[PDB]
Design an enzyme around this catalytic site. Structure first.
Site, mmCIF file in Angstrom:
data_model
loop_
_atom_site.group_PDB
_atom_site.id
_atom_site.type_symbol
_atom_site.label_atom_id
_atom_site.label_comp_id
_atom_site.label_asym_id
_atom_site.label_seq_id
_atom_site.Cartn_x
_atom_site.Cartn_y
_atom_site.Cartn_z
ATOM 1 N N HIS A 1 0.795 -1.209 0.000
ATOM 2 C CA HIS A 1 0.000 0.000 0.000
ATOM 3 C C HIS A 1 0.844 1.284 0.000
ATOM 4 C CE1 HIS A 1 0.850 1.103 4.162
ATOM 5 N NE2 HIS A 1 1.105 -0.186 4.230
ATOM 6 N N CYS B 1 2.587 -4.665 7.177
ATOM 7 C CA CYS B 1 2.421 -4.411 5.750
ATOM 8 C C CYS B 1 3.646 -3.966 5.002
ATOM 9 C CB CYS B 1 1.307 -3.359 5.540
ATOM 10 S SG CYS B 1 -0.218 -4.127 6.221
HETATM 11 S S1 QU5 Z 1 -1.777 -2.775 5.902
HETATM 12 C C1 QU5 Z 1 -1.497 -1.517 7.031
HETATM 13 C C2 QU5 Z 1 -1.589 -1.657 8.390
HETATM 14 C C3 QU5 Z 1 -1.335 -0.539 9.184
HETATM 15 C C4 QU5 Z 1 -0.989 0.694 8.598
HETATM 16 O O1 QU5 Z 1 -0.685 1.858 9.263
HETATM 17 C C5 QU5 Z 1 -1.245 2.029 10.529
HETATM 18 C C6 QU5 Z 1 -0.884 0.791 7.236
HETATM 19 C C7 QU5 Z 1 -1.148 -0.324 6.473
#
Ligand code: QU5
Length: 259
Positions: free
Chosen positions: A187, A205
């Site tokens: 992401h 992530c």
């Molecule tokens: S997948 C994801 C999990 C936590 C994040 O930031 C708090 C950003 C992406």
């Protein structure tokens, strides 16, 4: 006492080389063997595949290796009136036909901190990344690409972790491509563009640049592969939902039809 099946991928879809067939039932299946026998899968070119159950309601079929690009797949779930055990009967037949697109395999290497994308063997993109920090590392393994979101509110309570507890979070995120049911995504991470390629800072992530995350969103499809290698983490579970390929073929082939 009737159970309906649902098959994925959807009819007419073009999917990547890691996409297993998925038959989900709306009820626990007592007699997995009966369910398996009722499902006919035909491939062209022909390749050997096998069933393995991820939970009481969903069975998966795939080959030993990632599909060959171009393969056409036909699935006939011939469950109408089949006795699936404990007095439950197949409510209906379902079917799908799909084809396998180009081979797209992306590898995230924690030693280089680079996510490289290979399309049909050739590198087409090399993105700096920041993965899970040492205390919350990203697991190594083979991940199958699932859903994509232009924007999404990533909330840890989704996955059992309260937002305001130590590893918790709740954040708006752009250009998110899902790679595990446990909540790993590739992401857009505009905050860590300085750490990307250098330091791991995430909750798990794969943080990449906004423009790389958009590219990844635009050029990956369901069933493409992401492999994470060389992290300090564990291994993605084979029964994650998108972790099927981490179960070795010998074990997958043998199946679990009597459990
Ligand atoms: S997948 C994801 C999990 C936590 C994040 O930031 C708090 C950003 C992406």
């Amino acid at each position: 006492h009737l159970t309906m099946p649902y098959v994925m991928p959807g009819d007419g879809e073009v999917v990547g080389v890691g996409e297993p067939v998925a038959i989900r039932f709306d009820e626990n299946i007592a007699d997995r063997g009966a369910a398996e026998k009722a499902i006919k899968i035909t491939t062209n070119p022909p390749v050997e595949g096998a069933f393995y159950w991820l939970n009481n309601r969903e069975v998966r079929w795939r080959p030993e290796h990632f599909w060959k690009p171009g393969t056409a797949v036909d699935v006939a779930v011939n469950t109408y009136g089949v006795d699936l055990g404990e007095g439950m009967f197949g409510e209906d037949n379902v079917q799908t036909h799909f084809t396998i697109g180009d081979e797209v395999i992306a590898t995230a290497d924690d030693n280089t901190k680079i996510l490289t994308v290979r399309v049909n063997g050739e590198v087409v993109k090399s993105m700096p990344t920041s993965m899970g920090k040492d205390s919350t590392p990203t697991a190594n393994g083979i991940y199958i690409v699932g859903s994509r979101y232009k924007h999404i509110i990533m909330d840890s309570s989704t996955y059992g972790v309260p937002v305001n507890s130590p590893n918790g979070y709740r954040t708006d995120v752009d250009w998110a491509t899902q790679i595990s049911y446990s909540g790993v995504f590739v992401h857009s991470a505009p905050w860590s563009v300085g750490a990307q390629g250098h330091t791991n800072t995430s909750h798990g992530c794969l943080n990449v640049s906004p423009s790389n995350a958009q590219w990844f969103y635009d050029h990956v499809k369901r069933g493409d592969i992401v492999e994470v290698v060389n992290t300090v983490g564990g291994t993605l579970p084979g029964i994650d939902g998108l972790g099927d390929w981490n179960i070795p073929w010998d074990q997958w082939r043998a199946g679990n039809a009597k459990a």
